[PDB]
Amino acid sequence: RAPRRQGCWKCGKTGHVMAKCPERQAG
Ligand SMILES: [Zn+2]
């Protein structure tokens, strides 16, 4: 969630969902 702290570009923004995002950024 709250992608602004990275733009999720290494979290997975190339195809992830904001509820799978917490697995890579603890939030
Ligand atoms: Zn993310």
Protein residues with C-beta less than 5 angstroms from the ion ligand 1: 8, 11, 21
* Angle 22-26-27 from CA coordinates, rounded to 5°: 60
Q: Residue 19 is which amino acid?
A: A
CA dist 27 and 21 (Å) reads 8
Buried b or exposed e, range 1-27, using 16+ CB within 10 angstroms? eebeeeebeebeeeeeeeeebeeeeee
Residue 7 C-alpha to ligand 1 middle, in angstroms? 7
* DSSP-derived secondary structure letter, 21: T
Query: Which technique was used to obtain these atomic coordinates?
Result: NMR
Residue 1 C-alpha to ligand 1 middle, in angstroms? 6
Residue 3 C-alpha to ligand 1 middle, in angstroms? 5
* DSSP-derived secondary structure letter, 10: T
Q: Is the distance from CB of 25 to CB of 4 less than 8 angstroms?
A: no
CA dist 2 and 20 (Å) reads 12
